[PDB]
Amino acid sequence: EKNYVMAIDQGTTSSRAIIFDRNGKKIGSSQKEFPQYFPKSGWVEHNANEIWNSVQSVIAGAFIESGIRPEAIAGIGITNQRETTVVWDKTTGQPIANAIVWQSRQSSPIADQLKVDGHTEMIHEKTGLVIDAYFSATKVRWLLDNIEGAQEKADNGELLFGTIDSWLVWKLTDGQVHVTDYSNASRTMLYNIHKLEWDQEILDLLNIPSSMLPEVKSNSEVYGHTRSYRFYGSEVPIAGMAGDQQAALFGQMAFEKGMIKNTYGTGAFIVMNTGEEPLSDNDLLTTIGYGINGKVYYALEGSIFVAGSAIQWLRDGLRMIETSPQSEELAAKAKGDNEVYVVPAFTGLGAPYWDSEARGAVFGLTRGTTKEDFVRATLQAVAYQSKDVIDTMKKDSGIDIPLLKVDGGAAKNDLLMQFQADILDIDVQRAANLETTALGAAYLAGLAVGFWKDLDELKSMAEEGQMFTPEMPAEERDNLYEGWKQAVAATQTFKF
Amino acid sequence: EKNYVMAIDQGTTSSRAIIFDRNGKKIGSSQKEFPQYFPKSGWVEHNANEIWNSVQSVIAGAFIESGIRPEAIAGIGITNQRETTVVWDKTTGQPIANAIVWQSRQSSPIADQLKVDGHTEMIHEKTGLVIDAYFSATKVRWLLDNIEGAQEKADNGELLFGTIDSWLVWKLTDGQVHVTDYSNASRTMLYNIHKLEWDQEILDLLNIPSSMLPEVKSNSEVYGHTRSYRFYGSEVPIAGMAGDQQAALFGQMAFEKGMIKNTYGTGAFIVMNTGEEPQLDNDLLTTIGYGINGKVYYALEGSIFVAGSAIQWLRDGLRMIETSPQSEELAAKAKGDNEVYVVPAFTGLGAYWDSEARGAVFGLTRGTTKEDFVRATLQAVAYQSKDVIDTMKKDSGIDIPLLKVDGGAAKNDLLMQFQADILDIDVQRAANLETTALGAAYLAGLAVGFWKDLDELKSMAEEGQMFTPEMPAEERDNLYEGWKQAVAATQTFKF
Numbered sequence: 001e002k003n004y005v006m007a008i009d010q011g012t013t014s015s016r017a018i019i020f021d022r023n024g025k026k027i028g029s030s031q032k033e034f035p036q037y038f039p040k041s042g043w044v045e046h047n048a049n050e051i052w053n054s055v056q057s058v059i060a061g062a063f064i065e066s067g068i069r070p071e072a073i074a075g076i077g078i079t080n081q082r083e084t085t086v087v088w089d090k091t092t093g094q095p096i097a098n099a100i101v102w103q104s105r106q107s108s109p110i111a112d113q114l115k116v117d118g119h120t121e122m123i124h125e126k127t128g129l130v131i132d133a134y135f136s137a138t139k140v141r142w143l144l145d146n147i148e149g150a151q152e153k154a155d156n157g158e159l160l161f162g163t164i165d166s167w168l169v170w171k172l173t174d175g176q177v178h179v180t181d182y183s184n185a186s187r188t189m190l191y192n193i194h195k196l197e198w199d200q201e202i203l204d205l206l207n208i209p210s211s212m213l214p215e216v217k218s219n220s221e222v223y224g225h226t227r228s229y230r231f232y233g234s235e236v237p238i239a240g241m242a243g244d245q246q247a248a249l250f251g252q253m254a255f256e257k258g259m260i261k262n263t264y265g266t267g268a269f270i271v272m273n274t275g276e277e278p279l280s281d282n283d284l285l286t287t288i289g290y291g292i293n294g295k296v297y298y299a300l301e302g303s304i305f306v307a308g309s310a311i312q313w314l315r316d317g318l319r320m321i322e323t324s325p326q327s328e329e330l331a332a333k334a335k336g337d338n339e340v341y342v343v344p345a346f347t348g349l350g351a352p353y354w355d356s357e358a359r360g361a362v363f364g365l366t367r368g369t370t371k372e373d374f375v376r377a378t379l380q381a382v383a384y385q386s387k388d389v390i391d392t393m394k395k396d397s398g399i400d401i402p403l404l405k406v407d408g409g410a411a412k413n414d415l416l417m418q419f420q421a422d423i424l425d426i427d428v429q430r431a432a433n434l435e436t437t438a439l440g441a442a443y444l445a446g447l448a449v450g451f452w453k454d455l456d457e458l459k460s461m462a463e464e465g466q467m468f469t470p471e472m473p474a475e476e477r478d479n480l481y482e483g484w485k486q487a488v489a490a491t492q493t494f495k496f
Numbered sequence: 497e498k499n500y501v502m503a504i505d506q507g508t509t510s511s512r513a514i515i516f517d518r519n520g521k522k523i524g525s526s527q528k529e530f531p532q533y534f535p536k537s538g539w540v541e542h543n544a545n546e547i548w549n550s551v552q553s554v555i556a557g558a559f560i561e562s563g564i565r566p567e568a569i570a571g572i573g574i575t576n577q578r579e580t581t582v583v584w585d586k587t588t589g590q591p592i593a594n595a596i597v598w599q600s601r602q603s604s605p606i607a608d609q610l611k612v613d614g615h616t617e618m619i620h621e622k623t624g625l626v627i628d629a630y631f632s633a634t635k636v637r638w639l640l641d642n643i644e645g646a647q648e649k650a651d652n653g654e655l656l657f658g659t660i661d662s663w664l665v666w667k668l669t670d671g672q673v674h675v676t677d678y679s680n681a682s683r684t685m686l687y688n689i690h691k692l693e694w695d696q697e698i699l700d701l702l703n704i705p706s707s708m709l710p711e712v713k714s715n716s717e718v719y720g721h722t723r724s725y726r727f728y729g730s731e732v733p734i735a736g737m738a739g740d741q742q743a744a745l746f747g748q749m750a751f752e753k754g755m756i757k758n759t760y761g762t763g764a765f766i767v768m769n770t771g772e773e774p775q776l777d778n779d780l781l782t783t784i785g786y787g788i789n790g791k792v793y794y795a796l797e798g799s800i801f802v803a804g805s806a807i808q809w810l811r812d813g814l815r816m817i818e819t820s821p822q823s824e825e826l827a828a829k830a831k832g833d834n835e836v837y838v839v840p841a842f843t844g845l846g847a848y849w850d851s852e853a854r855g856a857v858f859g860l861t862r863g864t865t866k867e868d869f870v871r872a873t874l875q876a877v878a879y880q881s882k883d884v885i886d887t888m889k890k891d892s893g894i895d896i897p898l899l900k901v902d903g904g905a906a907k908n909d910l911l912m913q914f915q916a917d918i919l920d921i922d923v924q925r926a927a928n929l930e931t932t933a934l935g936a937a938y939l940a941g942l943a944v945g946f947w948k949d950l951d952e953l954k955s956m957a958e959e960g961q962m963f964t965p966e967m968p969a970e971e972r973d974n975l976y977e978g979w980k981q982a983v984a985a986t987q988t989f990k991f
Contacts, residue, residue: 053560060556060728064549069725229565233729 002074005451006062006236007442008055009244009435010080010164012101012266013312015051017058018438019066019073022451024461026433027068030061037098042105042347045098048086051164052171063232070234075449076172076226077240077441079247080164081266082187085139087212088167089153090160090175096147099164100139103267103305105347107138108356110145110206114138119205126192126199128278128286130354134303136163136188141206154209161212163188165241169223172231172238177224178214182296183246185216186288193288194278196296218291219246220448240445244437245269246289249299251440252405252431253459260393260401263437264410267350268307268382270389272300272397280396283352284389292447300397302351302389306360307382308410310344314378320371327375328413336373338480340364341487342381349492350385352392361491364483379413383420384484390424403427407436414466422472423481432463498570501941502558502732503933505740506551506660508577508597508762509808513554514933515562515569518946520956522928524564526557533594537854537991538601538843541594544582547660548667559728566730571944572668572722573736573936575743576660577762578683581635583708584663585649586656589671592643595660596635599763599801599843603634604851606641606702610634615701622688622695624775624782626849630799631685632659637702653707659684661737662710665719668727668734673720674710678792679742681712682784689784690775692792714787715742716943736940740932741765742785745795747935748900748926749957751950756888756896759932760905763846764803764877766884768796768892778891780847780884788942789950796892798847798884802855803877804905806840810873816866823870824908830871834975835859837982838872840880847884848987856986859978877905878915879979885919900924902931909961917967918976927958 004027009016013036018029034054037045063070083102088095100106111133114123123131133139140161144151153159162170166180185191185198190208192199198213217223219242225235242250245263249271252261257275262268271289278286278298289299311327314320321327341363343349348356362377394401404426411417411430421428433439446452452461472480500523505512509532515524530550533541559566579598584591596602607629610619619627629635636657640647649655658666662676681687681694686704688695694709713719715738721731738746744759745767756768769785774794776782785795802809807823810816817823836859844851857872889896899921906912906925916923928934941947 056560057556060560061553064552064556070729071725229567229729231729233724 002072004066004068004072005075005077005442005446006059006073007077007079007438007445008059008168009438009441010051010055010168011244012081012103015054015058016435016438017055017062018435018442019062019068020439020442024439028062028064028066030058030065032057032061040106044101044104046084046101048088048095048099048167051099052168055168070232070236073231073234073236074451075237075239075445077443077445078165078168078238079242079244079437079441080168080184082163082184082243082245083134083136083139084164085136085143086162086164086167087140087143087150088160088162089158091158093175096150096159097143100142102134103347104139105133105356107142108133110138110141123189123202126194126202127186127189128193128281129189130285132354132356137190137202137206140190140208144208151207154212157209157211159212160214161208162214165243166214169238169241172226173224174227177238179217179223180214181217181219181241182288182291183219183243184241187243191216193286193298220292220444222448237449239448240441240443242290242441242444245271245301246299247440247444248407248437249273249440250290250443251436252407253462254405255455258399261405261407262386264307264382264406264408266308268304268386270302270386270393272393274298274300274397282396283354283392284396285351292444300393302392304382304385304389305348305350306344306346310342310378310381313344313346314375321375327379330372331376331379332415334370334372334376336369338376339483340369340373340377341483342374342377343487343491344378344381345491349488351389353488353492355492357495358491359494361487361494363487363490379416380419382410383416383423384481386420387424387481401426403429405429405431407431407434409434417468418471421468421470423477425470425477428468430465430468432465498568500564500568501571501573501937501946502555502569503573503575503937503940504551504555504664505930505933505936506547506576506664507740508599509805511547511550511554512930512933513551513558514930514937515558515564516934516937520934520937524558524562526554526561528553528557536602538604538851540597540599540843542580542597544584544591544595544663547595548664551664556728566728566732569730569732570946571733571735571940573938573940574661574664574734575738575740575932575936576664576680578659578680578739578741579630579632579635580660581632581639581657582660582663583636583639583646583655583657585654586671587654589666592646592655593639596638598630600635601629601844601851603638604629604844606634606637607851610701619685619698620777622690622698623682623685624689624777625685626779626781628849629851630846631683633685633698633702636704636708640703647703650705650708653705655708656710657704657708658710661739665734665737668722669720670723670726672723675713675719676710677713677715677737678784678787679715679739680737683739687712689782716788716939718943733944735943736936736938738786738936738939741767741797742795743935743939744902744932745769745935746786746938747931748902749954750900754894755900757900757902758881760803760877760901760903762803762805762808764800764881766798766881766888768888770794770796779849780887780891786939788939796888798888800877800880800884801844801846802840802842803880806838806842806873806876809842810870817870823874824910826867827871827874828910830865830867832864832868834871835978836864836868836872837979838869838876839982839986840873840876841986845987847887848983850987852990853987854989854991856982856989858982858985874911875914878911878918879976881915882918882976896921898922898924900926902926902929904929912963913966916963916965918972920965920972923963925960925963927960
C-alpha cells in the first residue's frame, strides 16, 4: 500500500531522507555528512558526486529504519541547499568540477564587475535579488571561465547547469529529466521571477547558453519517476521540489501573506509569504516562495549566511568546543553580563546589510570573559541579526509581525529561542518537528500525487511545539540590541 | 549479467557485506556495528531487528560504494555468529524478545540442571558438544521460560526458532523460507550430527516444540530467493550458508583432515577439519564443518569466548583506549616484566567450560601501567589459543605444525608473532582477513555454478604473512606457566 512519502533534504553539510506516513509522522530517517572543500579562503565547494552518494545512503537508511517497501512510497519530495551550483557534462554524466556552494565567495570578482557595469537595477528588476556571489549566476560564469574547454562544451550543448534539486532529479532519472522548481530557479539570478522564465538578457550578459538550463516547473507536480534501480525496484514519482528555505516556509503552513518563519541551521533565513504579488523589498530579497495550484506565491527574504557554521568554527577553527552540541551546554553555563558580542560574518554581512567586505569580529571582551560567555555570544548573533531582518521586513511590508514560526536544528536550543523572543519582543513558535524543511517537501510531493487532498488537510495535521513568549523588559532588550547595533557598525568600520 | 557473489557476515559485533568477482576479488564492502546489551553479569543480548537493519545497511553500503547493482549478483552467501538464538512469531515476524548471544551465561542454570539430570554423555554422543549455555538449546528454553506466554505460543506452532543464519534468510525471503545449514544446526545442541536430524529426545527434555524448527540443508545449495523489496529490487538466489567459524575454515581451503585455523574476532575459535568419520567424548567440540557434494565433513573445535571483545571492553567499558587498533601501540610500549595477567572470562571460560568464572587480573603492582594492562589483555587470546592447541594435540594425537589464521584482530603483527612464539609453531595469516565472508561466498558460488567445483576455489588461494617462532623455550614456558596459574586462580572465584 502506498501509504508513505519520502522527503530528501540535501543540506549544506549533510543530506537527510525522511519517510512520513499519511498523518505526517516520521516513520524513518537517515542523515549522512559529505565532504566540504575550502581550496582558498572564502571558497566553499562540494563534490556533486559525493553529494549524490550521501543521498543514496540516506534513502537506503530511511527505508531501513522505516521498514516499509519502496513500492509503498507514494511520492518523493526533494529539497536542498539553494544557489549551490553544479555544472555537468551530459555526454559523460560527470560534473565538470566541484559544485560551488552558496557559501562560496570565489565568484565575487564576477559579481563586483557586474555592479561596476551598472547592472544592479536590471538584476533586481528581473530577479528580485541583489548582485552577489551568493547566487548561482556568477558561480556558473566562474565555472565556465576557469574550467578549460567548458565554454565551448556549453556552447555546443554538452554542458548542463543545475542547482542541487536539479542535480538530484537528474541522477534519480539518469538524465531523463532535467528540471527545477520556481523557488530554486529564482535563487539563480538567471531567472526572471516576473515573466516566469530564464532571463535571456541576463544569460547573454554572462554568456550562459540557454541549452544548459533545466525546464522550470511548479513546486508540486510529477516531474517524472525514478529509474527502478534508483529506488530499489520501484519507479517512484518525484513530485515535490523546493529550495530548502521555501520548503520550510511551506512546511510551516505559511500559506498566507504576512506569514513568516525562520530556519536556524548552517545559516539562518527569514522568509515571509507575500502572496501572489511580489511592494518594497529594501535591503532584502524578493524571491519565489512556491508555485502550486496554478498560482505563484512570492516571498520576502532576509539571509544570514553564518549561523550554525559559526559553531562549526568554534569546534574546527578555534577548537574551543570539541563537539557542536556542546555549545548548548557551554552557553547555558555563561555567567557574564551578556555584554560580549560576536558578529561571525566570516563571508560578509547578509541582510539587511549586504556588506560583502565585512569579516568576523568580536566586541565587549574583558579579562573576566569566559569560554561560556564567548560561546553564548556566538550563538546569540543569529538572534540579533534575525531581529535586524524582521524589523526591516516590518518597515518594508508595513505589516506587523506578532508571531515568528521557527524550525531547523539550532531551534532546539530553548535558551536561544527564548533569547530570540526576548529581543524581538514577539512570540516565537517552534515547530513540533524541527525538520520542517523536509516536511514541506513531503507535503509538496504528497499534494501532487494525491497523498493529501489540499492545503486545508495539511493544516489539520499542524502540530506546534513550544511557544516562547517575551520575558525581557524593554530597557534590557533595548540595551542588548543597542550593543549589537554598535558591534555591527564597528564591524563594518573595519575594512582593512 | 550475473558476474558477482555477495557474502553477508553477520558477526557478534558488526555486520559486513562484501561483493566478490569471479576471481574472488573484493570489489565492494560495507561494515556496520550494532548495539550490544549486557543486562547482567555474564549476560549478552542483541536485538534481532537491529541485527537485521545492520545487515540491510551493509548490503546497501556495498552496492552504493561499488556501484554494482543487485541484479548482477549470481548468489548470496550467508554466514553468522553461531548459537545466538532468536525466537519470533511466524505471523508478525517479530522476535518475542532480544536474541540471546552465544556468549551469554543467562541460561547457565538451565545447562547446569541438564548436567545434574545426567544428560551430559547423551548430549556429547548426539551433538558432539558439551552441555553449556554457549549453545542454542538452553537459550530457547530460557526464552520459553522467561517470556510471558511464549511456551503456549510455541506449543500452538506460532513461534519459530532460528540461529542468525535462519533469521536472516527468513527476513530476506519475507517469511517464505525457514531453514538452516548443517554447520549452524550442529551448534544448537538440538541437532544429532550423526543421524543428521533434530534430536527428539533433547527437544522433549527441554520441552521445545518441533514446530519451531527450521528445516536443515547442506551448506551449498539454493535455499530460496530474496524478495525484491528485501534485496533492493532484485530476486537473487540465497545459496551459501554456514556458521562464521566454519565459513572461515572453508575460506582457508582447510578441506583436508588435520588442516586447522583460528579466527581472531570478538571471540577466537580454533577449528580443525577432521574429515567424514571423526566421532572422536572429549571436552573439545565435535561439530559439523560443512556439508557439500553429498558428503558431510566434521571438525574439532576449541572455543574462546572473549578475545577481541576484551579490547572492545578496554575501549567502551574502562574507556582506557580511544580506538580498538590503539591497543597494539600501547601493548608494544609496555615496559613491565610481563608478569601481569588478564583472564578475559567476562562471559565464563570456553574450551575449561567454566560458566562460573568471570574476568580477572593478576600480578598488579604500583608500577603497572596502562601499557602493561593493555599488553596483558591482548596476550590473553594468544594464551587461551595455546590452551586449545595443546588440548587438541593431546586429545587427537595429531601434529599441529601450522596454524592458519584470519579475522580482524589478526592484523596485529605483534600479536600474531607472540602467538607463534608461545605456541612455538608457524602461524600463517590469510591474504584477506575476512576469510569468513570469502568462505560464505565460495559456498554460494559453488551452489549456483559461479565456480564449477572445489578445486577451482584452490586456484584463487592467496596466503599472507607467515609468522615463525623466535621466542626461547625458557621464556615461553615461564610466560605460559604464569597464565595457567592465573586461570587456575581465576577459577577459584566463583560467581
